[PDB]
Amino acid sequence: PRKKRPEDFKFGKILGEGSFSTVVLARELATSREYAIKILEKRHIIKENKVPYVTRERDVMSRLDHPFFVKLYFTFQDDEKLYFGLSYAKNGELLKYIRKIGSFDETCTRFYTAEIVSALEYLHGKGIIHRDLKPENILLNEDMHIQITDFGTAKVLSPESKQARANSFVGTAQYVSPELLTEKSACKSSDLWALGCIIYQLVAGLPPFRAGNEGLIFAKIIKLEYDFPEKFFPKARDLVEKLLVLDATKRLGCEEMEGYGPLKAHPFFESVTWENLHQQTPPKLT
Numbered sequence: 001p002r003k004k005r006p007e008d009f010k011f012g013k014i015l016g017e018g019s020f021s022t023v024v025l026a027r028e029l030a031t032s033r034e035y036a037i038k039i040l041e042k043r044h045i046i047k048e049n050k051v052p053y054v055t056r057e058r059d060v061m062s063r064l065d066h067p068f069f070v071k072l073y074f075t076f077q078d079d080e081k082l083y084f085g086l087s088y089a090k091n092g093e094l095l096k097y098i099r100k101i102g103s104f105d106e107t108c109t110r111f112y113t114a115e116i117v118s119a120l121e122y123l124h125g126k127g128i129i130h131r132d133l134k135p136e137n138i139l140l141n142e143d144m145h146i147q148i149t150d151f152g153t154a155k156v157l158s159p160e161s162k163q164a165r166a167n168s169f170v171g172t173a174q175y176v177s178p179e180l181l182t183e184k185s186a187c188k189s190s191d192l193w194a195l196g197c198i199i200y201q202l203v204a205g206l207p208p209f210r211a212g213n214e215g216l217i218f219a220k221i222i223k224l225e226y227d228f229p230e231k232f233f234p235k236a237r238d239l240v241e242k243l244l245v246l247d248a249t250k251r252l253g254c255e256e257m258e259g260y261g262p263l264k265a266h267p268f269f270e271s272v273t274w275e276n277l278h279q280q281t282p283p284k285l286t
């Protein structure tokens with residue numbers, strides 16, 4: 001289609017602001033479609049060494065075509081700004097719901113966990129590591145299905161070299177894997193560690209490794225220092241214990257453990273119908 005330009009849109013409210021970006025709700029005049037447009041100031045990206053992250057976000061998102069990810073529909077630029085035209089995730093961040101309700105019941109934990117698993121199976125099947133998976137980066141569409149975002153710190157592993165490890169230090173302290181901290185690289189299984197943290201957080205209300213200082217969190221991660229609250233769905237506890245494993249080759253779902261089939265077969269997921277999840281009505285969050 002014709003390359004889009006800023007004047008092809010009418011902007012509405014600011015949906016959010018990052019360190020180097022503003023996301024605005026926009027309507028495209030010629031179609032009346034709604035988009036979330038992420039806008040970055042070139043001068044700021046250039047001054048602050050962010051060009052590789054912006055180009056990575058574009059490159060990674062352009063590869064994805066799955067219902068559980070924010071879609072990148074188009075990109076354009078003008079003299080001052082870069083623009084990404086994204087699907088609008090009307091219901092915002094998963095984290096908002098954890099905070100408000102405190103935790104999720106078993107049905108809701110299972111459903112949202114299954115969507116995240118399905119998303120990770122797709123991403124890992126394309127040889128992509130997210131590296132910053134966390135509830136703030138799991139958005140929710142109007143129908144309350146997940147829309148994973150934040151790909152500027154993802155990594156496409158090279159198929160040509162059969163690359164498995166990625167060397168950049170990126171992530172969020174509560175969710176960062178022990179291998180990145182101790183070996184200085186991440187792998188696809190690093191996202192499975194984050195998944196374990198997220199499942200724990202949905203059930204318990206807080207992620208498992210937490211402190212007021214990042215270094216204190218790192219020290220607990222590397223020692224596997226965490227505990228479960230007395231009441232925690234038992235099959236979910238078992239699943240978390242199979243994900244929060246220091247040795248990245250021993251996490252359920254990883255390539256060395258024979259991939260996503262065994263993970264989808266975990267007893268916590270016994271009632272899940274994997275094949276049409278994105279067309280199922282999500283359970284109401286109460």
Ligand SMILES: Nc1ncnc2c1ncn2[C@@H]1O[C@H](COP(=O)(O)OP(=O)(O)OP(=O)(O)O)[C@@H](O)[C@H]1O
Nearest residue numbers: 015016017018019020021023036070086087088089
């Ligand atoms: N597609 C979208 N639909 C709805 N809201 C969105 C969408 N994408 C991002 N947001 C919201 O806009 C803000 C996120 O912005 P963005 O990706 O620009 O930066 P960030 O990742 O939050 O920040 P930082 O770069 O500082 O880590 C957040 O509140 C986020 O939830």
Ligand SMILES: [Cl-]
Nearest residue numbers: 020050053054
């Ligand atoms: Cl950036």
